[PDB]
Ligand binder design. Structure first.
Ligand SMILES: Nc1nc2c(ncn2[C@@H]2O[C@H](COP(=O)(O)OP(=O)(O)OP(=O)(O)O)[C@@H](O)[C@H]2O)c(=O)[nH]1
Ligand SMILES: Nc1nc2c(ncn2[C@@H]2O[C@H](COP(=O)(O)OP(=O)(O)OP(=O)(O)O)[C@@H](O)[C@H]2O)c(=O)[nH]1
Ligand SMILES: Nc1nc2c(ncn2[C@@H]2O[C@H](COP(=O)(O)OP(=O)(O)OP(=O)(O)O)[C@@H](O)[C@H]2O)c(=O)[nH]1
Ligand SMILES: Nc1nc2c(ncn2[C@@H]2O[C@H](COP(=O)(O)OP(=O)(O)OP(=O)(O)O)[C@@H](O)[C@H]2O)c(=O)[nH]1
Ligand SMILES: [Mg+2]
Ligand SMILES: [Mg+2]
Ligand SMILES: [Mg+2]
Ligand SMILES: [Mg+2]
Lengths: 429, 435, 429, 435
């Protein structure tokens, strides 16, 4: 009931998804072979939302892993946790997009999308009652950004009356992984703003600091970095996967959070984050949980909220608490930190409570804040994209595979408009 | 699954290729005879499988003078290469580009093309061409321009990378080097996606100073250049935490259609005795590779400004301190990038530590870095070569050899004006401009 | 309830505190591992004042240990009694202040003062009522005096309606530990007399003499020296940690003993002080205890009271007695020694009685006297500072890191004013 | 953590450093090869850890003549030092200050700076530099003043201590010592935070009389001076009941920017057989080190007045009898202090007893004291040296070697008036002033 479709694009999506389906398997008591070995029947109460029933009590995920370059798939197939996926879903192309938008939207986008859309339709018809779509990708790569935009569009005419959540890894200010980031990002964001519902922007170096500073890890690899982002992603969904005292669903989050069609870029955060050695000297209690969430340091996006104002805020608890303690503390937060909240939405705190605590923790929480601190992220990206484009650098290889200058002019004009409306509403009276 | 073919031209290409296929075979755990004693595909991209356990490379050795190929035929790697692939002529171009491109070079180009077409149709996921050729040599320069024209005509749009050998400023071996280089650059300027340069003494300075060897035969020089080539391809051959494809190199390094002349660098290059007294940390090999004295082209980067860089770490590498290391490099004073490129770094990581060739001068290392810098310090080297060519041609020296072998002085004029356009574009792009 | 924050600055504060938390742990029956192993329930009646309840009945002290160099924390962290502190509290710098005021208040202190201040605000949010701050530092070092004053000025801004006590270690008149003492001390006092409520001045040679003749120890190391000052420091606080017939607390002491805003420099004292061998020849009873404290020998500050007059006096008894015997002796002390008391404060004796005896003792007492004889201590220090300053000796390395000539002029101009009023009130009629 | 790098200059520095770095591995339990059979860091301040168990010192050996370094390379401590660190020239300065500062010294100073900058960036918490240079030599004096100029600009404000070797009054191995010493002191006066002076003849009296040794070779002299250096930095490497730092020494001993010339002193210095007949109490080693005959510079403290002192105990030392001992020392009429310094003592205690090298002349002691007196008695020594320089320069003797090597006669006037200013300033603040 209320089934969810999970789509993966680019190298990041497959690596994040590899850690994702690891978390879900432990949550639902699923052996790597694919057979139920747990005890509680509560996990079976709603198992069809993600997994799928099969013969001999086998379970297969509703995931569609697809990427142009094959190199990622041999890793997921040959590696562990590859005995439970559906071999038909393992879609791959022939050559990677090469960090090019054009090769991800016109050249190799044509033949690959037709194949992947077929598996979506078959998966949708198998579904009993569709709830929405989940897409995990990156805005810096070529295949994940370029094709993911194409897939988001092709899905959109097919299911107009549906919602989707895109958990994108937005590029960093400090360190840039690839040289031509702004060309892929600016083009991708223009299309997403047109035809998407909500978007959870996530940074890398911000999660780098969190792992090194708070968890005190000397060598934070991609294994640990992707592990933390999976827990936030599992926390967002678990409201409808598991019963709770004040339940919420993907539809509830979308409407509570998005006041306007063009302002749907969120910023997540998770708590508690404690080291292995320092967990014994801290009291696991709601006061410190909410305090840990509401500081700039424990935030998974590299934008300090102090330069902006929280437009709307969510908080999806887990474990067992009191609504009194939960909402008494939201009062203490609101009264003390009132200078940082937008004046013209009152009571802008949405709270939901579950009952199943996360593994190895008495209780935890997930904070999703639609803030005005993203305006500094888009301003910087637009600045980087502007200077590079005026001198017409790297342009010969987007023009040489389908596009021309009119796409670049209109994408820049739209992005300037969006940051204009974003600021003009923050400074409204 | 994704295939790239390698063409070796001239004595330089064959000798480098002997050292290159020395290390690819070692990297994939293949005995010299084709049998065998991460691992399982990987070898499918280079070593085509015969029905038995024998693997044969996708290499096309072509030369006009047969003594070098007769060496590789009779060498230790006799059973590896396909006997049809080794194509020999009868007499070389004798450092005459006119001979190697018009008169004699045209009589064997049909045979090499047929072997290329047969090999390409054998594969299913052809990606691009790797060309190993020199610049001074008559056959190396003469044949490569013919092959680029022929290959580009057959295959419309594919990646075409060349690993050239840039002529030196004081080290000289030929007397017609300014004539061969200028002719080669003009004709292949439009048909090369990305061409790497290497200077012979720059490794000699590196081998003498960094590794402290006083007997650096061409074997030791070939071993160092071979290491750069493999780790560039190693992303295609091996999985990694951040994979980079041949187009990704080509897309991330070429900002303009004409400015596609980067240079290579490798690190760490340290000896066996000094291995014990070093810690081989990620933060310092990033600093060591970027150090101007470690560049493998006889040009100081301090004289110019970088335009784009690409790093490739392999082995036990964490993306965090790699992230930290580039942050300090960017904020450092000596390094200066160009204004229109606020971001100028591409990073690729692989899980396979580099292997060591037995008996090699280098020491075993668990981390390796390869740096491809597209900069403006190369522009000073082009001007110097242009000056040498203009001095010699000023009184029509050696032109009687070239003119008699099917050329005219008009062609020399066009190549001269071509290099002026390339040099004027290179400086005007590198220099800042208002608005 | 009525929690207090304990701050340690410098090497002395860390060394005093390292043995201070030794005595506090025995009083509350705390094992070195951090788990309660006591018997009487009265210990847990008020345990939250110093310790913090945590998971699985573990207790974590409310301490903030900070030093500009790592040479001090290496001992406490690696040594015993280091498995119960919270590692977040273990704040340290990189290079010591080097016995310089400038390198601890202007240049190096500012870098680390932001980290400790953020811990202070985070320190006892769980803590529900602040009673005050307890600071242990030195007036001769660089980090103990330099940034310790920096913390006082900054902390006072955030908690203005609160009282704090600094248990400083005032310099010596016979042997000086550091060559540039007067420059460091005088610059500190000019800032201390403005942002503190009361200061406990303690000497070292006076502690040496007491441990030599009275305790019969010929070679007292720093371990046997700091044990004497811990008991006095624990005696002042134990009024609000344990029940008593006539209770007192930190706020109570400040009212009785600060007649004027600038005259808040006290002189402690402890009794009984008897050797282990000669403990069988004395009868433990109130008669000798009151006589023991009021002689010049058993005084922890090297200033003979006979040259001055007591203004106000404490006697925070412990153990069990009858207040009649207490006030029968305070009457005998007053009548026989009436020449050593100020005329214009009648009945200037404050007495409080507790109910829990110190460890291994039937009864004990703590004497705190806001005597006038301190005026001779500040007279000597201002004499040494004057001789050094006219020659401008050692001063070329104070102006070189932030200061100038005008600052030194005002610090001495204010200090001679303080010693003027400290004596003008004694001779006032 | 806390880092300080050591520069060894000239034959004196390399010979002293061979004994000095011999002691540190003894203190930290480091075998000569690198392996091992209070202890956990500690060695991170001097021994930079390699990934393996091998420790390599943070020392830079620089010299112009390869005779002495080759002994270090071939010595028993062959595997410890980093082979790149041992920097050699080709010929020495030959007791010529001009050669080692202008002509030949300048051509190699860039190489040593490269190893300094590389080593400093490797460490994290660098504090300052320890320089082991003499005064009479050419490379030990001429080249080290160049290093001060090079090091100071790169690192603006850091501690800089030079453990000099003061030329002796009557003992003189060289003939141009007054010309060398005056020139190097003038240029290094404004770039040295704290310079320690040692006289070679002063130790000889100490070794003959106190230690009862009749064959005091340079290896026996160097063992005794090594103990002074070790205990100065004994506080950084070990915990203590009262710790001192590089800065704590540097601000407690320099009342004026020019007057930063203290002198060392060690105690106890007694033989093996004489150990039994001495009880070795704290109250007397404080008295022993204050005796005029145990000073390490041939200047009687009675002729002058102490300005500041600094004691450093280590071992089974309790602070109660320490400050008691100084109390009796202060009231003694033989030791007199300056009026404007009512307090002139600084103490530092450690829990690590000094260790003894095997085969050494000194016996095992559970306590040790190092006294670093900044006194006016050294002003008489500057006057004596200035007298010799003024005597020979009057008729311009030996000048032709210096003038023809890149100097001027005018430059000698500046160095002469510079010592004129210092000699009176030392006395004028040492003597009382009106009002
Ligand atoms: N969080 C996270 N991000 C990653 C990880 N690996 C790569 N990324 C990000 O993803 C981007 C890579 O672009 P991709 O879309 O994956 O490109 P690709 O899959 O190699 O294929 P092409 O787009 O054709 O190059 C980089 O910019 C990284 O910032 C990962 O393991 N975890
Ligand atoms: N790095 C490297 N360069 C080489 C080696 N052998 C030759 N060269 C270069 O090749 C140049 C000689 O021209 P070649 O391309 O070898 O000419 P060829 O192969 O003999 O055939 P012809 O051009 O007809 O004479 C010299 O300038 C060298 O710089 C080698 O083993 N290693
Ligand atoms: N009572 C007592 N006093 C001590 C002890 N250790 C040091 N002191 C005093 O502390 C002073 C030393 O200055 P500190 O404040 O410790 O200086 P620091 O912490 O080392 O930091 P810097 O000033 O930068 O060196 C001396 O004057 C001693 O009188 C101790 O163990 N017990
Ligand atoms: N204490 C001590 N002093 C030494 C030793 N060796 C040389 N000296 C001193 O060094 C002085 C000689 O000048 P050096 O500094 O050694 O000159 P150098 O290092 O040989 O370099 P050049 O001047 O160029 O020859 C003599 O006056 C000695 O006092 C030694 O082993 N121990
Ligand atoms: Mg990819
Ligand atoms: Mg040839
Ligand atoms: Mg200190
Ligand atoms: Mg010499």
């Amino acid at each position: 009931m209320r089934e969810i479709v999970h789509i993966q694009a680019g190298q990041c999506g497959n690596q994040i998804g590899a850690k994702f389906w690891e978390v879900i398997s432990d949550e639902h008591g699923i052996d790597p072979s694919g057979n139920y070995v747990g005890d509680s029947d509560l996990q079976l109460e709603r198992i069809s939302v993600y997994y799928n029933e099969a013969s001999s009590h086998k379970y297969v995920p509703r995931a569609i892993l697809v990427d142009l370059e094959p190199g990622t798939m041999d890793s997921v197939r040959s590696g562990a946790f590859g005995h439970l996926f559906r071999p038909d879903n393992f879609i791959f192309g022939q050559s990677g997009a090469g960090n090019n938008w054009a090769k991800g939207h016109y050249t190799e986008g044509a033949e690959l999308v037709d194949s992947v859309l077929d598996v979506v339709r078959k998966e949708c018809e198998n579904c009993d009652c569709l709830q929405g779509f989940q897409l995990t990708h990156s805005l810096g790569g070529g295949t994940g950004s370029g094709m993911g935009t194409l897939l988001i569009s092709k899905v959109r005419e097919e299911y107009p009356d549906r919602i989707m959540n895109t958990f994108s890894v937005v590029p960093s200010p400090k360190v840039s992984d690839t040289v031509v980031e702004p060309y892929n990002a600016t083009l991708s964001i223009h299309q997403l703003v047109e035809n998407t519902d909500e978007t959870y922007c996530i940074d890398n170096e911000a999660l780098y600091d969190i792992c090194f500073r708070t968890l005190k890890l000397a060598t934070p690899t991609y294994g640990d970095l992707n592990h933390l982002v999976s827990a936030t992603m599992s926390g967002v969904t678990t409201s409808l996967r598991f019963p709770g005292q004040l339940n919420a669903d993907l539809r509830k989050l979308a409407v509570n959070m998005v006041p306007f069609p063009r302002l749907h870029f969120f910023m997540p955060g998770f708590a508690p984050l404690t080291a292995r050695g320092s967990q014994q000297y801290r009291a696991l209690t709601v006061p410190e949980l909410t305090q840990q969430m509401f500081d700039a340091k424990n935030m998974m996006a590299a934008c300090d909220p102090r330069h902006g104002r929280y437009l709307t805020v969510a908080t999806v608890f887990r474990g067992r608490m009191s609504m009194k303690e939960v909402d008494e503390q939201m009062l203490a937060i609101q009264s003390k930190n009132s200078s940082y909240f937008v004046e013209w939405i009152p009571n802008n705190v949405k709270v939901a409570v579950c009952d199943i605590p996360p593994r190895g923790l008495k209780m935890s929480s997930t904070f999703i804040g639609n803030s005005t601190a993203i305006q500094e992220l888009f301003k910087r990206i637009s600045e980087q994209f502007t200077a590079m484009f005026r001198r017409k650098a790297f342009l010969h290889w987007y023009t040489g595979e389908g596009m021309d200058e009119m796409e670049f002019t209109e994408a820049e004009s739209n992005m300037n408009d969006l940051v204009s409306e974003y600021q003009q509403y923050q400074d409204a009276t | 699954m994704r295939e790239c073919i390698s063409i070796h031209v001239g004595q330089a290409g064959v000798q480098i290729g002997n050292a290159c296929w020395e290390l690819y075979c070692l990297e994939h755990g293949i005995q010299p005879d084709g049998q065998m004693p991460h691992h399982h595909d990987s070898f499918n991209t280079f070593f085509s499988e015969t029905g038995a356990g024998k693997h044969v490379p996708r290499a096309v050795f072509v030369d006009l003078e047969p003594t070098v190929i007769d060496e590789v035929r009779t060498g230790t790697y006799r059973q590896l290469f396909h006997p049809e692939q080794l194509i020999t002529g009868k007499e070389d171009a004798a450092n005459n580009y006119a001979r190697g491109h018009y008169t004699i070079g045209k009589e064997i180009i049909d045979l090499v093309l047929d072997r290329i077409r047969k090999l390409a149709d054998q594969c299913t996921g052809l990606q691009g061409f790797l060309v190993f050729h020199s610049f001074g040599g008559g056959t190396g320069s003469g044949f490569t321009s013919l092959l680029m024209e022929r290959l580009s005509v057959d295959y419309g749009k594919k990646s075409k990378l060349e690993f050239s050998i840039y002529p030196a400023p004081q080290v000289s071996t030929a007397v017609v080097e300014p004539y061969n280089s200028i002719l080669t650059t003009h004709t292949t300027l439009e048909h090369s996606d990305c061409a790497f340069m290497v200077d012979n003494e720059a490794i000699y300075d590196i081998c003498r100073r960094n590794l402290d060897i006083e007997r650096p035969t061409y074997t030791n020089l070939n071993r160092l250049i071979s290491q750069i080539v493999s780790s560039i391809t190693a992303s295609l051959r091996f999985d990694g935490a951040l994979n980079v494809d041949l187009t990704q190199f080509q897309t991330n390094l070429v900002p303009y259609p004409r400015i596609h002349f980067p240079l290579a660098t490798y690190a760490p290059v340290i000896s066996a005795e000094k291995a014990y007294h070093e810690q081989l940390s990620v933060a310092e090999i990033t600093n060591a590779c970027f150090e101007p004295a470690n560049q493998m082209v006889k040009c100081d980067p301090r004289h110019g400004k970088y335009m784009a860089c690409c790093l490739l770490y392999r082995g036990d590498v964490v993306p965090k301190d790699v992230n930290a290391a580039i942050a300090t490099i960017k904020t450092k004073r000596s390094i200066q990038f160009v204004d229109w490129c606020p971001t100028g770094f591409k990073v690729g990581i692989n899980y396979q530590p580099p292997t060591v060739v037995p008996g090699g001068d280098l020491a075993k290392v668990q981390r390796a870095v390869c740096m491809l810098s597209n900069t403006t310090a190369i522009a000073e080297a082009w001007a110097r070569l242009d000056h040498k060519f203009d001095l010699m041609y000023a009184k029509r020296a050696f032109v009687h050899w070239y003119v008699g072998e099917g050329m005219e002085e008009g062609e020399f004029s066009e190549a001269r004006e071509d290099m002026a356009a390339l040099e004027k574009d290179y400086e005007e792009v590198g220099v800042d401009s208002v608005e």
